[PDB]
Symmetry: C5
Subunit: 212 residues, 5 copies
Amino acid sequence: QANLMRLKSDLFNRSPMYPGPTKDDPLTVTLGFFLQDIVKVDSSTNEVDLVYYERQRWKLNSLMWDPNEYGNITDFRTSAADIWTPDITAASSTRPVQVLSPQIAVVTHDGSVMFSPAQRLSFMCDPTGVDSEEGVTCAVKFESWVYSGFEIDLKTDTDQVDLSSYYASSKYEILSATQTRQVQHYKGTGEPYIDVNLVVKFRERRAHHHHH
Amino acid sequence: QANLMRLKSDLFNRSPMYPGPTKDDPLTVTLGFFLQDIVKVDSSTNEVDLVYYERQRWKLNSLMWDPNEYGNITDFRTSAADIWTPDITAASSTRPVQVLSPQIAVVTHDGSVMFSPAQRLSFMCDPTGVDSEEGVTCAVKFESWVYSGFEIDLKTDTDQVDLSSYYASSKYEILSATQTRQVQHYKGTGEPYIDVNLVVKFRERRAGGFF
Amino acid sequence: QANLMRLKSDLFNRSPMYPGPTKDDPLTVTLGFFLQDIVKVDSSTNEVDLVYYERQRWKLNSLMWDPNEYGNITDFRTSAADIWTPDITAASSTRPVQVLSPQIAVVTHDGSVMFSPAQRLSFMCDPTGVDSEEGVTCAVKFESWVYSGFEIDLKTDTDQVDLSSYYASSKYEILSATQTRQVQHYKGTGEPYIDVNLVVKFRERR
Amino acid sequence: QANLMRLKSDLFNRSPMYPGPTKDDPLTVTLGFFLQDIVKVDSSTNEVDLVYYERQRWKLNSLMWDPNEYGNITDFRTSAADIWTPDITAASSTRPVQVLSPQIAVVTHDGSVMFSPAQRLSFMCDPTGVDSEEGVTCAVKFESWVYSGFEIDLKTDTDQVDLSSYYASSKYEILSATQTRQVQHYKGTGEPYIDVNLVVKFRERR
Amino acid sequence: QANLMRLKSDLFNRSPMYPGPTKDDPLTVTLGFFLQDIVKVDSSTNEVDLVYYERQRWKLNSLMWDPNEYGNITDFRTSAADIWTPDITAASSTRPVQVLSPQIAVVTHDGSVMFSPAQRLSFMCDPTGVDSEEGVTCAVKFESWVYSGFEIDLKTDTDQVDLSSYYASSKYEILSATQTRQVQHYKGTGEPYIDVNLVVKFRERRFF
Ligand SMILES: [Cl-]
Ligand SMILES: [Cl-]
Ligand SMILES: [Cl-]
Ligand SMILES: [Cl-]
Ligand SMILES: [Cl-]
């Protein structure tokens, strides 16, 4: 308790917060998607609702410490308000993303941050053909809304979306689910930016006592 | 009033907040569920909505005091913002949990904290067969989202969900309701983590029902 | 303006906030319900929606002052964030209560606080029979979620719910509406706690 | 920029906020409604949804300044959080009011404040007869939730609701729309309070 | 990291925030709309729902710096809470606008600010005729809610709404989409104010 209090005090109260990347000090954020359910499909509005969590990893020198100086603490948990987090946005959402997990991150002695927000997302998807063998395919790009490719790079460890927590009794069966890094260019300023394109192909399933 | 003001001042304004558990100083959180209603079932989205409250208990040395030093105060109530609370999460929720009770906890002179949030939860459940005698079974795991089993352990006092506040005129009759501690392992990591599995077996209310 | 600024400064900035009742210094909260409408009835989910306001009264020595010392001010209005308020909860709600009025209370020179939140509440109610002469009865208990009867007592001034603001053209006609203090015990006779039971008997209007 | 920074610093950082009216220093608030649409009518719940904006005007000595001392600035815009605003409430709402405009007010050198919140409101209204020639009438009272008539008075500049921004292709046609000051009396208290009664007569478009 | 920390500290902690424009120091805000989808149409309430993002640009002397004094930093990203932003409002909305993007802006060494909020908007629109060839036309004015034309001017770089991110499989096909500056006058005070009128002509999606 006491060593961790010191560690957090040293990291967060002494110095200000990481202000974000720049051209001279860019940052790489690694993303992985863990799809849990296709909850809803709306053929009258062409909206589909996903529940997933999104593993995000990055690394900052400012969050390094020597474990020997803090009782051999190698990592800790702390509110996401205590740190900078990347502004990763679903570019074709139709409602604000709903947060399903606590806004808490894991910080490791080398300055690695892991943040794994669970989300419910409504996004643009025509579900016509979902009730067939071939099913339907839909896509959503995840990107930093404000940083170019000169400041932020996004990558994946694998192009396969993890389906190991996918709900076994979902209304919808997943045929294919990929997460692919792409290079893109803004309209008015033509400078590059990175996205990770989530492409999911799916179809309807077939074969002294108180407290109150 | 005056003694309590001193007590809260001494506990909360002197020291910073408990920063959470670590490998060297882990924490045990005890959970108990008090199911009040199955409000809704949606067969087109495979979502079911529960209303319950969840008794949570844990213990911290930093919240100890000697009652003799504070006018024989043995316990007090305080806003949950004044203290650390565990990040217990329904792992198969489909909407943010809605809070139905005040965010207030009870702290006791030995450093025990009791926090009993009432919640409405939407979660993943195929209700096909709910309109039969046998009914349907659904499950939801409750776990710390960010702490492994090295930092947080979860347990129960009993594996039976309390149904004593269950709505007598619910659309749904509870046939069985259990809360069972389970050991689990993360995919990429491989290190262990604990959940409490809430398993509820229910059906649409009928006169009476296997004869 | 100036005298009130002094008064609020003296009450709120000098001392900390009232920390809540204890066994040695318990508190009595008086409740009164003013039912305005039964807005919705859902027979598929057994939920009913009420709109009402709820008069709450309590009294603290820490909020007393002598009017002579503050330009004869007998009472004032202030944000509910400036003071402690009781944690009165509908025990069978199914959604978070929606707030329909400003979170502002009235404080009086004797230390009386009056807080009258307007609310929309969804709660557990089987409405089967609402479309008959006899109608249907539903109940919801209002209680402190965290305080026992040793710390908080609840009472009413009358056991009759006030229907003087009840919407004349509601879909639902009120046959009876009562608010009754009850003594209760946590689980298998644990320590006591108080609730006010709101019982409303109603039917479709003719 | 610099003069305005000084002005705001002088008004908001030196003195505390206006604490609200009292019996000895009451306040007059003028209201005007600008009805933009009847968006929805629900005959199963007797709820109707309006979109409008509400001009509110009041005056405080504490917000006066001499323009000559601040580069001839006669008025400015500032966040509503920087000032006191009246607690004007629709008394028969069924959902929390949704805010459609930025919470920003206009302050003028004589201490006049203009605040014009756009709102979407659900309120109690039986729409039976809306699909006829005569249409239907509905009413909603706007009042301070916590202040009596001894502390707050409400007035209008005209008893005619402004329909100049009313949506030309609404589902509903407005036949008449009035805003009328009324004197009222509390149940338990008996002391007076003021409301402005918004009465709208409308029907389905033909 | 260190130079940017200094820059932000110098701009935001030393001086107070820009207090907004005045008659003597007015501000020009340039708007551009990027329509992404017509999500919904409700013929029973005459409401239509758009998803778009809105590029906003303005310029303040108080946000200037010399890049040479801050490790050649030419621009940075920062929370919109750190700065003044214009109060641009859809005048015929029927629900609060829902925010779909992070509230973060880009500031450039000359004092230019770019803020590009993605929004979902419900607004007043009779969709009768949407299921025909000719389709239907709807309009929504975007304006400062509180500032007159003496304090705020709005303009566009083009009168064509950008449709390059418009969802190819939307229920609704865009026939035409324009963004036009207009001069307007308040009722009681007869002084001018500016809006940008977004006019969208569309129809339900449909050679054999
Ligand atoms: Cl950081
Ligand atoms: Cl703590
Ligand atoms: Cl208090
Ligand atoms: Cl003020
Ligand atoms: Cl600024």
